[PDB]
Ligand binder design. Structure first.
Ligand code: CLA
Ligand code: CLA
Ligand code: CLA
Ligand SMILES: CC(C)=CCC/C(C)=C\CC/C(C)=C\CC/C(C)=C\CC/C(C)=C\CC/C(C)=C\CC/C(C)=C\CC/C(C)=C\CC/C(C)=C\CC1=CC(=O)C(C)=C(C)C1=O
Ligand SMILES: CCCCCCCCCCCCCCCCCC(=O)OC[C@H](CO[C@@H]1O[C@H](CO)[C@H](O)[C@H](O)[C@H]1O)OC(=O)CCCCCCCCCCCCCCCCC
Ligand SMILES: CCCCCCCCCCCCCCCCCC(=O)OC[C@H](CO[C@@H]1O[C@H](CO)[C@H](O)[C@H](O)[C@H]1O)OC(=O)CCCCCCCCCCCCCCCCC
Ligand SMILES: CCCCCCCCCCCCCCCCCC(=O)OC[C@H](CO[C@@H]1O[C@H](CO)[C@H](O)[C@H](O)[C@H]1O)OC(=O)CCCCCCCCCCCCCCCCC
Ligand SMILES: CCCCCCCCCCCCCCCC(=O)OC[C@H](CO[C@H]1O[C@H](CS(=O)(=O)O)[C@@H](O)[C@H](O)[C@H]1O)OC(=O)CCCCCCCCCCCCCCC
Ligand SMILES: CC1=C(/C=C/C(C)=C/C=C/C(C)=C/C=C/C=C(C)/C=C/C=C(C)/C=C/C2=C(C)CCCC2(C)C)C(C)(C)CCC1
Ligand SMILES: CC1=C(/C=C/C(C)=C/C=C/C(C)=C/C=C/C=C(C)/C=C/C=C(C)/C=C/C2=C(C)CCCC2(C)C)C(C)(C)CCC1
Ligand SMILES: CC1=C(/C=C/C(C)=C/C=C/C(C)=C/C=C/C=C(C)/C=C/C=C(C)/C=C/C2=C(C)CCCC2(C)C)C(C)(C)CCC1
Ligand SMILES: CCCCCCCCCCCCO[C@@H]1O[C@H](CO)[C@@H](O[C@H]2O[C@H](CO)[C@@H](O)[C@H](O)[C@H]2O)[C@H](O)[C@H]1O
Ligand code: OEC
Ligand SMILES: [Cl-]
Ligand SMILES: [Fe+2]
Lengths: 37, 32, 34, 37, 65, 340, 50, 34, 51, 32, 335, 35, 35, 28, 82, 51, 51, 37, 34
């Protein structure tokens, strides 16, 4: 159970989510700052 | 690999059914 | 205000120099044969 | 050039197609044995 | 048109044509199964590629009999 | 809703259009290009191919490359945090981790880019015939850099990202696969070569059948950016080629679709051929020819000649081209002609 | 009228004839299968499975 | 078996060629307006 | 997958597609079912070619 | 048999060339 | 008769001919006909040819065991070299066919005709009041035929080293070329593929953009091509909508808005690219070959550290070492 | 064989003469406008 | 007009410009390495 | 040893004979 | 034909730009230079130094022969003073 | 099975204008794709399970 | 011999292109249509259809 | 039965025939060698 | 020579069948009144 390669998988699955997070985090923020019509 | 093209083709033809047969007037582009 | 034609000609030569530096390195660096 | 006034249209009805195909196929079913010999 | 025995019984199943849910309906819930599916595929892929090793799973012609 | 506000921002007309597609395109596209330029200057191929492959080692723009991983790796994705590199970056580089890096990222970058084509077309309200066309380059990249090595033993036999490293990929396919003799490849070149003809001939045709819409000799200024009349005489163009070549276009709408069809179709045929080379299902030989050549020692064709060239290519290259095989070919076993 | 590569667009909104089409297709695929099998049985040699 | 090599294509062309001729005509007849 | 397929099935028989999606994926237009089906068909094909 | 097949197809292409050039659809202007 | 010769000149020059027989045509038409007829007969029925002059006849015709892919017209003997070998220079046709006689007859007649073909592409343009330079675009593929059929043999000293008239024969020419010259590592060649790749690229670019920005004049179940009539006044596509799209694909200023600047680029790129590739073959006809980076990068002790350039060299040796088996007697291949 | 040479030479001379005397016969004139 | 400074274009531009010069400096130094 | 000093001067000489003209404004 | 961004032409011409970039641009250059000249680059990417391709006597290549124990195998290659 | 599907193909060709394909509202031919998918997916999973 | 031979062939060729370019322009300049076809008097439109 | 109102006529112009035949023949000239092998 | 027996009929049908298809259509188009 919980082998070294499986731990590495979580590391890559978590570090990936983070990238998606910060990206969309920034995007959602800046998007709601200017768009008047 | 061949069916990839068919997907891209029909998919395009679905989302672009309106602009199929051609386009029509106006002159907007470079100004939001 | 710096005249455009000067900006290019200076950046132009600046490019010929560094790239020319590369061509020299073809006869001296590790990319040599000696 | 002047459109040649000697031409007529050509016609082949559906039965004639059927009668024809029936002729071609059975002839082939008859002679194929001799073609393979 | 032309009604039939079978046709009438199947009439209800085909009638709610343009009927949609309002707004973003079940979309957000769907987006979760979608993300779960993506990770799911990534798992069985990396297992097949031996990028994800698990003692008990031996991705070879072995472990068979 | 935040979504439509997120949308609003993305689809804003900037200098460099982002869009939803951009969320996928720009990250990968940059990493792919960046990864190459990195490996090109810094990372070596010593531990993987026994080769120098960077400016740091002395290679020039031609000889530099981001070489494939070892054959030992197999078809491993070679993740930085994978069982091989084990999170280590330096090791990752030395094991040719940058290759799968460039390949996979670039792969998604090509997906994002066509999506961009689709997305932008939709907004501007134009037909997506630019996305349909771009499918040919996709098929090629997919078939050659992914499908092909997936059929072979490992990523090692995939084309390495580099100028010279691509030249060997050509010579390899000649020697081992006899790729030039493949009907699907021939259609390939016919499309590219024929496509490069259409490009030339049409451009030249238009520039030299133009109407006079100005008083200057440099007729470039004399063009109306806002449609109206045809800038060049289609009717004159027609009668010209009809008298010099015998055949000529007469439907700009067909002429331009034809310009799409030819090079796109060619690239697709060449892709199929490569997909077959993955399983090594090549068009190497003509059985009728070999049978006669065996019984009859005086029978010689340019086909027979070429195969002898392949034998030489395979024998003399294999040792240093496939290190993992530990090849040792004695001088006496090396196929050679006279004197040479 | 219709180009050769568009002849089947005659079904895009004709559910009856579309089902009729799919039925014909399915028949062909099932037809091939049965008959492709007979071809193998008429040529396959079971004399040695080793 | 020990049949004629040309028997196959001879039978094939014997069916198609004339059948083709007919179909060409029928379909050309069928599509005549009015 | 069968049970999941049975459940997911009942779902789509009951719950209707969100307006946003129906508009987006041009549903009620059979040539969009083709686009997605083809997408899945070649996905499966690439897999069986691999296995 | 093979030689025959090759020349035949070739001869057919040349035949097509002829018809393509001299028996084309007359390219008519404006009123088409 | 207003004057027979005056009438003759008016007929030749006449723009009312189905095919424009020009003054260049007076030379083209006969030369191209001899080339083609001789070719067709050879490719089918010509006997084996001793190309390398080593009494080792190579059969390349259909009737002599070849198919379309393998079949070819074999270059003249190496014993002949650059000597002129017309039919009337042989004791017999049997001899003429054995020493690769047909080859010269073809290449000479073709190159002559193909040149006049370029000359005619000017003449007709002159007679019709349109601008020239179309023939200038055709000078690139012609300059390639010249390089491959004439310039390289001249440089190498024999027509036997000219590119054969056939599929597989063309492959042999390339493979061997690469061995003796390392063409892939030559700038002019690289510019050629750049022009050829870019060409196919731009051909698809222009093709798609235009066909994608067509003004609607057709039904949903009607060919979009019929929305154009031969001899239109106005344009059939929205070039401003085309520019709007492509301008957003990359960025505005990296997009064409001038159709004339567009089509010029469409013509200039491949023609120029192929021009260099033609000059490449013509240059390597005098043994000015591609870059030689063999054993360049070496380590601190002096050991040779291999590059891809070396891996290329191994492939090249194999070609070199095996080509023309029995033709060489001496160490260096200076021919 | 010595005959064929003569025949060919005559033939080639013919077309070549037709070519030179051709452009000589006021060829620049032959065109739409200014001549 | 009152143009801004930091924009998306600015970002894009720098993602390529900044490493480039850094590489151009790196490569330039390599020309003096020997053995 | 380092004749790059030469090139430098003769190199900037070119743009100089027109720069001075951008100063004295005339005849470009 | 215009968007929000400040016209490049103006910026590349503005004295303010150069006052900035006469510092920034060479800075990056010198940094990249040091990156190589200090030999740091060699360690960041495990690239062999001219005296680090073979051992003194050895003439064999340090080819990685197995995926999972590759990293360990690589480290072992550096051991023999390679 | 092929022969039976054949005969079936013919019947559905002649009797194309079944009311089942007509929408009660618009009176024009129409197929409710979202519910159909649900039906088929249910049958698929049910058959998948059994297999 | 290699340097000279190669250099002067490249030059000789491009000059043949330069020849064609400048000779083609001169013929059109003289006759006077080197700047485009006259929209009004379009020569081709005055010639019988060969079709 | 009611005449199905979904049918349209089919068309193939002379050029398309020529363009077609050219494709088929040259493809045959290309693959025939490999069919005979 | 020692070629494929099916090569001949494979080539024959590869030409006829699709050419046949075309001609069927062309002739059927050609005969449409008006
Ligand atoms: C959005 C753009 C994008 C995309 C599509 C990719 C795609 C990829 N990158 Mg990548 N990358 C990006 C941006 C992107 N990158 C950026 C901006 C950087 C700079 C930091 C990098 C730096 C980078 C490196 C350094 C490496 C990659 C690698 C990879 C590949 C493998 C990564 C992987 O396993 O994904 C994993 C996928 C995910 C994590 C997605 C998960 C999303 C779900 C919905 C979240 C669920 C999380 C949750 C906790 C799960 C709960 C389940 C529970 C049971 C635990 C893959 C092709 C690797 C590679 O190329 O290997 C050769 C590699 O080594 N990337
Ligand atoms: C799930 C499979 C599938 C289905 C149901 C369709 C259905 C359709 N396609 Mg399509 N397509 C597919 C896959 C599919 N395609 C794939 C994989 C590709 C990529 C190659 C394409 C590329 C494509 C294009 C480019 C076009 C269509 C068009 C069409 C529409 C009209 C078809 C027509 O009249 O052609 C009739 C075709 C013929 C009469 C000639 C066919 C001759 C073939 C090529 C020779 C081989 C026949 C052989 C028996 C096939 C064996 C099947 C094989 C899979 C085992 C129709 C809705 C057209 C459209 O949308 O109309 C506007 C259109 O222009 N498709
Ligand atoms: C009464 C029904 C029936 C039965 C019992 C069989 C039985 C058989 N057929 Mg068969 N067949 C049938 C109807 C049937 N056929 C029909 C109607 C057709 C015409 C279309 C065919 C066409 C056909 C061919 C062409 C072939 C067979 C073959 C076979 C044999 C092997 C089957 C196999 O490997 O599965 C194959 C299994 C699959 C293809 C799996 C499909 C699963 C897909 C990918 C999933 C679809 C997506 C799904 C909707 C996603 C949601 C699911 C959800 C649970 C998540 C077997 C004896 C083979 C044989 O040996 O010939 C005799 C063969 O080559 N069949
Ligand atoms: C956003 C955000 C988050 C910021 C980060 C940005 C970021 C990191 C980006 C990284 C992206 C990256 C690494 C690179 C992307 C690759 C890239 C630059 C693409 C290459 C584009 C390029 C420079 C080439 C252009 C080629 C060119 C000359 C065009 C050919 C034009 C041509 C002949 C077309 C024919 C044609 C043109 C017309 O114009 C019209 C009209 C018509 C009719 C027509 O036929
Ligand atoms: C912002 C805009 C920048 C965007 C960058 C995008 C990437 C552009 C391509 C990068 C080219 C890098 C070339 C380079 O680094 O060479 C750098 C090399 C380095 O030079 C080498 O240095 C080594 C040091 O040990 C050795 O000494 C070698 O001897 C020596 O040659 O220079 C060359 O010699 C080649 C000359 C440059 C030729 C480049 C032509 C590229 C043409 C194709 C363009 C793409 C299409
Ligand atoms: C000196 C004369 C030399 C003879 C030249 C011979 C020309 C070959 C003609 C091919 C047939 C043309 C045709 O089918 O379409 C004739 C059509 C002309 O008809 C077109 O019809 C279209 C449909 O409506 C559009 O309306 C176009 O506007 C219209 O012009 O040409 C084209 O559209 C396609 C252009 C591409 C032509 C093919 C190039 C020929 C290459 C031959 C390679 C095969 C060699 C095999 C060797 C064995
Ligand atoms: C994905 C795309 C990512 C793009 C990333 C940003 C790239 C920045 C490019 C700036 C160049 C530019 O703006 O145009 C620079 C100028 C345009 O000039 C413009 O003038 C405008 C006037 O209102 C504004 O002042 C703009 O600021 C100014 O850029 O050049 C153009 O006219 C055409 C450039 C086309 C370049 C295409 C690539 C070819 C490169 C040649 C290299 C081969 C040698
Ligand atoms: C050793 C020397 C050998 C000498 C040969 C003997 C003399 C030549 C006899 C020619 C007989 C064949 C006639 C051909 C008719 C024809 O071509 O079109 C008939 C048309 C109609 O005009 C023509 O026809 C008109 C009469 S009529 O309309 O045809 O009735 C006429 O009035 C007009 O003047 C004329 O232009 O002729 C032309 O358009 C003139 C151009 C003819 C081009 C010749 C062929 C070009 C070949 C190029 C090279 C090809 C390479 C191989 C290709 C596979
Ligand atoms: C890898 C990796 C990564 C990435 C990074 C990056 C992204 C980088 C980038 C980098 C870059 C981005 C670089 C660049 C470079 C560039 C260069 C280096 C250039 C050069 C150029 C030149 C040299 C030029 C030349 C020329 C031309 C080509 C034209 C003509 C003229 C001349 C000569 C000027 C990360 C960390 C994420 C993660 C891990 C992995
Ligand atoms: C009616 C009926 C019947 C009968 C039935 C039958 C008899 C059936 C059959 C059927 C069949 C018998 C079918 C078959 C089919 C087949 C097919 C359908 C095939 C196809 C093929 C193909 C399509 C191919 C293609 C190709 C080629 C040609 C080459 C290249 C490759 C490929 C593969 C692509 C009975 C009595 C029972 C009862 C009921 C009634
Ligand atoms: C990229 C570009 C550009 C730029 C360019 C450049 C950068 C140029 C440069 C140029 C140059 C840089 C020039 C120079 C020149 C110089 C000269 C021309 C000089 C001469 C001199 C002489 C001749 C003298 C000599 C001598 C001496 C000094 C001493 C000894 C003796 C004697 C007296 C001999 C532009 C803006 C256009 C724009 C487009 C892009
Ligand atoms: C979309 C998805 C994008 C994902 C991008 C992820 C990029 C970062 O990826 C991450 O890199 C770091 C190193 O910097 C690795 O970290 C690794 O090295 C560090 C030391 O440097 C160790 O302490 C760590 O135990 C090891 O896992 C992670 O194992 C890897 O997951
Ligand atoms: Mn055919 Ca050019 Mn290798 Mn010397 Mn012979
Ligand atoms: Cl050889
Ligand atoms: Fe165009």
């Amino acid at each position: 159970t919980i082998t070294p390669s499986l731990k590495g998988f979580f590391i890559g699955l978590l570090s990936g989510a983070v990238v998606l997070g910060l990206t969309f985090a920034v995007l959602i923020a800046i998007s709601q700052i200017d768009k008047v019509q | 690999l061949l069916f990839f093209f068919g997907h891209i083709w029909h998919g395009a033809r679905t989302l672009f059914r309106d602009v199929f047969s051609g386009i029509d007037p106006e002159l907007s582009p470079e100004q939001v | 205000r710096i005249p455009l034609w000067i900006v290019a000609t200076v950046a132009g030569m600046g490019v010929i120099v560094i790239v020319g530096l590369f061509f020299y390195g073809a006869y001296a660096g590790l990319g040599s044969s000696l | 050039m002047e459109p040649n006034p000697n031409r007529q249209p050509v016609e082949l009805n559906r039965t004639s197609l059927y009668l024809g195909l029936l002729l071609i196929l059975v002839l082939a079913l008859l002679f194929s044995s001799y073609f393979f010999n | 048109a032309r009604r039939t025995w079978l046709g009438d019984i199947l009439r209800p199943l085909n009638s709610e044509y343009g009927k949609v849910a309002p707004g973003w309906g079940t979309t957000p819930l769907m987006a979760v199964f979608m993300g779960l599916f993506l990770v799911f595929l990534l798992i069985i892929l990396e297992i097949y590629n031996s990028t994800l090793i698990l003692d008990g799973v031996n991705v070879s012609w072995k472990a068979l009999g | 809703g935040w979504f439509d506000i997120l949308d609003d921002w993305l689809k804003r007309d900037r200098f460099v259009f982002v869009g939803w597609s951009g969320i996928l395109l720009f990250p990968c596209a940059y990493l792919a290009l960046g990864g190459w330029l990195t490996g090109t200057t810094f990372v070596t191929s010593w531990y993987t191919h026994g080769l120098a492959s960077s400016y740091l080692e002395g290679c020039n723009f031609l000889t530099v490359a981001v070489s494939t991983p070892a054959n030992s790796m197999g078809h491993s994705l070679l993740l930085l945090w994978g069982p091989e590199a084990q999170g280590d970056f330096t090791r990752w580089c030395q094991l040719g981790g940058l290759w799968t890096f460039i390949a996979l990222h670039g792969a998604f970058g090509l997906i994002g880019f066509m999506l961009r084509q689709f997305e932008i077309a939709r907004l501007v309200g134009v037909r997506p015939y630019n996305a349909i066309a771009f499918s040919a380059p996709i098929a090629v990249f997919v078939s050659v850099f992914l499908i092909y090595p997936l059929g072979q033993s490992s990523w090692f036999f995939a084309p390495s990202f580099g100028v010279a490293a691509i030249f060997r990929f050509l010579l390899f396919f000649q020697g081992f696969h006899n790729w030039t003799l493949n009907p699907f490849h021939m259609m390939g070149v016919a499309g590219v070569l024929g496509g490069a003809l259409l490009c030339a001939i049409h451009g030249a045709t238009v520039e030299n059948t133009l109407f006079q819409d100005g008083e200057g000799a440099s007729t470039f200024r004399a063009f109306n950016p806002t449609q109206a009349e045809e800038t060049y005489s289609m009717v004159t163009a027609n009668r010209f080629w009809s008298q010099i070549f015998g055949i000529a276009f007469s439907n700009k709408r067909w002429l331009h679709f034809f310009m799409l069809f030819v090079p796109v179709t060619g690239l697709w045929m060449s892709a199929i051929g490569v997909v077959g080379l993955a399983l090594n299902l090549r068009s190497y030989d003509f059985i009728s020819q070999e049978i006669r050549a065996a019984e009859d020692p005086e029978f010689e064709t340019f086909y027979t000649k070429n195969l002898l060239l392949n034998e030489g290519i395979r024998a003399w290259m294999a040792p240093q081209d496939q290190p993992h095989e530990n090849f040792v070919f004695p001088e006496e076993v090396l196929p050679r002609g006279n004197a040479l | 009228g219709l180009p050769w590569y568009r002849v089947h667009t005659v079904l895009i909104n004709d559910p009856g004839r579309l089902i009729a089409a799919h039925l014909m297709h399915t028949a062909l695929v099932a037809g091939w299968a049965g008959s492709m099998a007979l071809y193998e049985l008429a040529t396959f040699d079971p004399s040695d499975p080793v | 078996m020990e049949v004629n090599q040309l028997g196959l294509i001879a039978t094939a062309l014997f069916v198609l060629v004339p059948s083709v001729f007919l179909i060409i005509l029928y379909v050309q007849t069928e599509s005549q307006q009015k | 997958a069968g049970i999941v397929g049975i459940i997911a099935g009942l779902f789509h028989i009951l719950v209707r597609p969100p307006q946003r999606l129906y508009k987006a994926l041009r549903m009620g237009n059979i040539e969009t079912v083709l686009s997605s089906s083809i997408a899945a068909v070649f996905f499966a094909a690439f897999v069986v070619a691999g296995t | 048999m093979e030689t025959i097949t090759y020349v035949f197809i070739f001869a057919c292409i040349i035949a097509l060339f002829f018809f393509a050039i001299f028996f084309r659809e007359p390219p008519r202007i404006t009123k088409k | 008769s207003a004057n027979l010769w005056e009438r003759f000149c008016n007929w030749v020059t006449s723009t009312d001919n189905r095919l424009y027989v020009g003054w260049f045509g007076v030379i083209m038409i006969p030369t191209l006909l001899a080339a083609t007829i001789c070719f067709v007969i050879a490719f089918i029925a010509a006997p084996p040819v001793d190309i390398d002059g080593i009494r080792e006849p190579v059969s390349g015709s259909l009737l002599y065991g070849n198919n379309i892919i393998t079949g070819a017209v074999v270059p003249s003997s190496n014993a002949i070299g650059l000597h002129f070998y017309p039919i009337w220079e042989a004791a017999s046709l049997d001899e003429w066919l054995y020493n690769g006689g047909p080859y010269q007859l073809i290449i000479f007649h073709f190159l002559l005709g193909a040149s006049c073909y370029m000359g005619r592409q000017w003449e007709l343009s002159y007679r019709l009041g349109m601008r020239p330079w179309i023939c200038v675009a055709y000078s690139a593929p012609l300059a390639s035929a010249f390089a491959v059929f004439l310039i390289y043999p001249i440089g190498q000293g024999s027509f036997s080293d000219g590119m054969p008239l056939g599929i597989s024969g063309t492959f042999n020419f390339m493979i061997v070329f690469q061995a003796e010259h390392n063409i892939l590592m030559h700038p002019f060649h690289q510019l050629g593929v750049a022009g050829v790749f870019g060409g196919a690229l731009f051909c698809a670019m222009h093709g798609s953009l235009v066909t994608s920005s067509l003004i609607r004049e057709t039904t949903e179940t009607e060919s979009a091509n019929y929305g154009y009539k031969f001899g239109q006044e106005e344009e059939t596509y929205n070039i401003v909508a085309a520019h709007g799209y492509f301008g957003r694909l990359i960025f505005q200023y990296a997009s064409f808005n001038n159709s004339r600047s567009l089509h010029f680029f469409l013509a200039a790129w491949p023609v120029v690219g192929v021009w260099f590739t033609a000059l490449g073959i013509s240059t390597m006809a005098f043994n000015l070959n591609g870059f030689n980076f063999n054993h360049s990068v070496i380590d601190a002790k002096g050991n040779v550290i291999n590059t891809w350039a070396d891996i290329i060299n191994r492939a090249n040796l194999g070609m070199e070492v095996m080509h023309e088996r029995n033709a060489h007697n001496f160490p260096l291949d200076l021919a | 064989m010595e005959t064929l040479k003569i025949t060919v030479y005559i033939v080639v001379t013919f077309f070549v003469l037709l070519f030179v005397f051709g452009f000589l016969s006021g060829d620049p004139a032959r065109n739409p406008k200014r001549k | 007009v009152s143009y801004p400074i930091f924009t998306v274009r600015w970002v894009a531009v720098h993602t390529l410009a900044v490493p480039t010069i850094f590489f151009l400096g790196a490569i330039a130094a390599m020309q003096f390495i020997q053995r | 040893i380092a004749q790059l000093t030469m090139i430098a001067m003769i190199g900037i000489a070119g743009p100089m004979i027109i720069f001075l003209l951008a100063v004295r404004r005339g005849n470009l | 034909g215009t968007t929000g961004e400040r016209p490049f032409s103006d910026i590349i011409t503005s004295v303010r730009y150069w006052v900035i970039h006469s510092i920034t641009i060479p800075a990056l250059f010198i940094a990249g230079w040091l990156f190589v000249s200090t030999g740091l680059a060699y360690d960041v990417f495990g690239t062999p130094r001219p005296d680090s391709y073979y051992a003194q006597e050895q003439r064999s290549i340090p080819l990685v022969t197995d995926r999972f124990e590759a990293k360990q195998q690589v480290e072992t290659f550096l051991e023999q003073l390679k | 099975l092929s022969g039976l599907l054949f005969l079936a193909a013919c019947w559905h060709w002649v009797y194309w204008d079944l009311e089942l394909f007509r929408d009660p509202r618009t009176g024009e031919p129409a197929l409710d794709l979202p519910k159909m998918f649900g039906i088929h997916l249910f049958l698929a999973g049910l058959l998948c399970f059994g297999f | 011999r290699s340097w000279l031979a190669t250099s002067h062939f490249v030059l000789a060729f491009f000059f043949l292109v330069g020849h064609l370019w400048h000779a083609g322009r001169a013929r059109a300049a003289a006759a006077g249509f080197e700047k485009g076809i006259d929209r009004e008097s379009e020569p081709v439109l005055s010639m019988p259809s060969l079709d």
